[PDB]
Design a protein around this ligand. Sequence first.
Ligand SMILES: *[C@@H]1O[C@H](CO)[C@@H](O[C@@H]2O[C@H](CO)[C@@H](O[C@@H]3O[C@H](CO[C@H]4O[C@H](CO)[C@@H](O)[C@H](O[C@H]5O[C@H](CO)[C@@H](O)[C@H](O)[C@@H]5O[C@H]5O[C@H](CO)[C@@H](O)[C@H](O)[C@@H]5O)[C@@H]4O)[C@@H](O)[C@H](O[C@H]4O[C@H](CO)[C@@H](O)[C@H](O)[C@@H]4O[C@H]4O[C@H](CO)[C@@H](O)[C@H](O)[C@@H]4O)[C@@H]3O)[C@H](O)[C@H]2NC(C)=O)[C@H](O)[C@H]1NC(C)=O
Ligand SMILES: COc1cc(Nc2nc3ccccc3n3cnnc23)cc(OC)c1
Ligand SMILES: [Ca+2]
Ligand SMILES: [Ca+2]
Ligand code: NA
Ligand code: NA
Ligand SMILES: [Zn+2]
Length: 809
Amino acid sequence: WTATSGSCKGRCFELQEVGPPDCRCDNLCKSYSSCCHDFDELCLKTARGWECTKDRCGEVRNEENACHCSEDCLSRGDCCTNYQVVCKGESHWVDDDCEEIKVPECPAGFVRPPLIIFSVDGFRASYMKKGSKVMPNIEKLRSCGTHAPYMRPVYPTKTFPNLYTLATGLYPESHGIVGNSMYDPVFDASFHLRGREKFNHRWWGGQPLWITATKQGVRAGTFFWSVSIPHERRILTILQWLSLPDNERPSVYAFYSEQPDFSGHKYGPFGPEMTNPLREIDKTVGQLMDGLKQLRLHRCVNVIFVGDHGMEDVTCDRTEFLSNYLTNVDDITLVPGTLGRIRAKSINNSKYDPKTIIAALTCKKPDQHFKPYMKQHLPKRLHYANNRRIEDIHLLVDRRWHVARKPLDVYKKPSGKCFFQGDHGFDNKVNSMQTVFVGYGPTFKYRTKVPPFENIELYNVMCDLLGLKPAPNNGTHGSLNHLLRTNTFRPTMPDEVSRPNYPGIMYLQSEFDLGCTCDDKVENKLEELNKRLHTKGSTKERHLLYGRPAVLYRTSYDILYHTDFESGYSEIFLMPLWTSYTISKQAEVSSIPEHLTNCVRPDVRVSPGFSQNCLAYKNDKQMSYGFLFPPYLSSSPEAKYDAFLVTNMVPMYPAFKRVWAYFQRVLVKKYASERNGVNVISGPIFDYNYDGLRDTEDEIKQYVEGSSIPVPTHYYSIITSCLDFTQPADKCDGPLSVSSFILPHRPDNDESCNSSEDESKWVEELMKMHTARVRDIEHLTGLDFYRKTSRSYSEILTLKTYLHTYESE
Ligand SMILES: *[C@@H]1O[C@H](CO)[C@@H](O[C@@H]2O[C@H](CO)[C@@H](O[C@@H]3O[C@H](CO[C@H]4O[C@H](CO)[C@@H](O)[C@H](O[C@H]5O[C@H](CO)[C@@H](O)[C@H](O)[C@@H]5O[C@H]5O[C@H](CO)[C@@H](O)[C@H](O)[C@@H]5O)[C@@H]4O)[C@@H](O)[C@H](O[C@H]4O[C@H](CO)[C@@H](O)[C@H](O)[C@@H]4O[C@H]4O[C@H](CO)[C@@H](O)[C@H](O)[C@@H]4O)[C@@H]3O)[C@H](O)[C@H]2NC(C)=O)[C@H](O)[C@H]1NC(C)=O
Ligand SMILES: COc1cc(Nc2nc3ccccc3n3cnnc23)cc(OC)c1
Ligand SMILES: [Ca+2]
Ligand SMILES: [Ca+2]
Ligand code: NA
Ligand code: NA
Ligand SMILES: [Zn+2]
């Protein structure tokens, strides 16, 4: 109940929210059906429109008008935004030459430059170039300020997950808004775009920027606008708030536009109907900038122009139907569209089985346009599993497609034809899903292009712009320092927690009873000292190029040196946490010699009690083994024996060994050829609770049969070279270049529909799907890489957030 017979007189767009049953006058009151009776009359004036004209100049104030052109309007803070242009001979902001903003130029009483976030729903990254001729104001912000060629959204590339990621710095799995539609089994409650459940605070986790600001004494505008409030009135409202006295005036503001998304769904991303929405958004930016200029704030305010996601061509004819795959289609609930989420229709149905649903959905039709996954098997870069609101069964839908349960879901009578031509929600690496970032103002750089980055990083920067301490989030604070003129965040590297042991030769061959064998008894004062030097680390500068990784948790591990590679060997997990090696452009690939095919050699530096054993693998009929440093890339026949050390062995399903052997035998050399040498760090990952974070020992769900050898959920590699590929990886003077992956360690290759073919036809495609940031691997391993370079730490942080996407231009 709302007692709507209170009044909005002197309260229009009030900042403090009033509790029911008192009536509201704020920018969201319409959405709750709670505005006071006179809110339209007083707060939503429209008389005479939004622009001054020649004959209104100096008019007698008329309080009915939408905006004013009277002499007093500047002191009232309510002139039409073009007032000074029409009436006082001023230029529009867009027509002024751009001039560097070296220092904030703010009116007296301003404690900090205000921040305005201008959010555009569905604004695809390529609109910045493709629409630049019809967007002069946006083009001036872009060219004069700091811009990225695109900004990567989070998955799923839907509105609420992305807007809330922008506001919190959190992945959707952590902030809880995991789709535009959700079911929470604990609450037993459903969240939808339409309706009232979405306003309940229990859906919304983390700490969004407006709350962070308010807790730390920085006042915030109310960020959200009821859809029927016209854009011109949103802008006027912001400009009016900026005229409040110092003690009452917010420092952070948000504008939101439902366009170009609204038209993009109807017309497709590049429909000819899309030009008009882009022109209208540009005109709104112009209104805001003209308004700031009138207030003498256009060289004071930092403006962020940012989108939530892009838009792809999707039509209802490109829909896959689960009714063509599943017998039991009425026993499932599907969240449909550009992603699929499946769960049981009834929790009372004990005949429901996820295994049989996955199998019925796996590689069934030659050109199938979706792929099913248990959520823990989704690419780790999506960070889309650790939330009870994410159903166990997920469908990744190809770009340009939909999935639905049955045909009747997609049509309506009489004709059955559908309407829409655009949609979004697909994999956040998809080019059509990318969106925009421009920052303009005193705190941003002048005429500066920055590389693409992820929207999870922006919360930290917005906090920096406002002098706030960010709440704990998934950005990497400092990774976007290069966007900023000042207010940089200068982090220090994390302290190492565990120091390594450096074991020497401590065990005789006969102390080992591991059940391994090797044909290695091939029996020189010259060369003996040489092998001893290798074991003490004489080649370590070649193979460990950026320092040893730091171990950021408590554990016992050993550094092991060899001719061709260095490793950090965990006595707890019985295998390396990391193995590091450099392959120059000139390196040659060799075979595993016949006499060494099944060779595994005790490591006399490591106790039998802290070693794997071969008997366990013999007895585990499902599990085989591979090596982290690959024997194919040994520097000589003699160094090759080091590769068969039991301390270089890791458990691998035979299906996985197909993938790994091809990576090691073919792809590493290919990358060294193309990149002029590579440095490779490889290792295991254990994430059995799919939280994106390193498992402790007591979280491990699977061991090699009969043993304490834990089975990795994933294997990673980090592949580093010189950004200037005219320098070899091992003699690089400047910035680095990286690509990495986190490959799921699966007992089958059911994910790759073409796996019965030669690895040259499917393995690299798999690895691209599982591309990763170094930071992703850091979270999953508790290691900290690139500790010793010649590069600045913020530059390294940017490198650690890089994702190599394998998407064309
Ligand atoms: C991305 O960045 C984020 C933010 O930094 C990282 O997330 C953090 O990760 C931490 C580790 O997973 C986690 O720390 C835990 O906090 C628990 C208290 O949590 C509440 O309080 C915080 C602080 O205000 C709040 O933010 C939380 O919010 C979550 O939950 C609410 C309500 O459900 C949601 O609205 C919200 O969306 C958010 O949900 C997300 O996180 C939770 C986990 O907290 C998930 O379950 C959800 O799926 C979703 O992803 C909470 O309201 C605290 O209880 C934990 O301590 C337990 O574990 C330790 C181990 O050290 C143990 O020693 C303790 O005894 C305790 O165990 C007891 O409970 C166990 C489980 O019930 C039980 O098994 C034991 O036997 C014990 O009884 C823990 O410290 C932190 O909460 C989140 N923060 C957020 C915002 O998500 C995230 O990791 C980053 N991601 C990557 C990939 O890097
Ligand atoms: C959800 O979390 C955030 C929301 C917004 N804003 C808005 N999101 C909308 C989403 C759908 C429909 C209308 C919407 N709207 C209208 N007026 N403002 C908004 C901004 C956020 O950060 C700057 C974070
Ligand atoms: Ca959107
Ligand atoms: Ca984990
Ligand atoms: Na075996
Ligand atoms: Na297959
Ligand atoms: Zn949309």
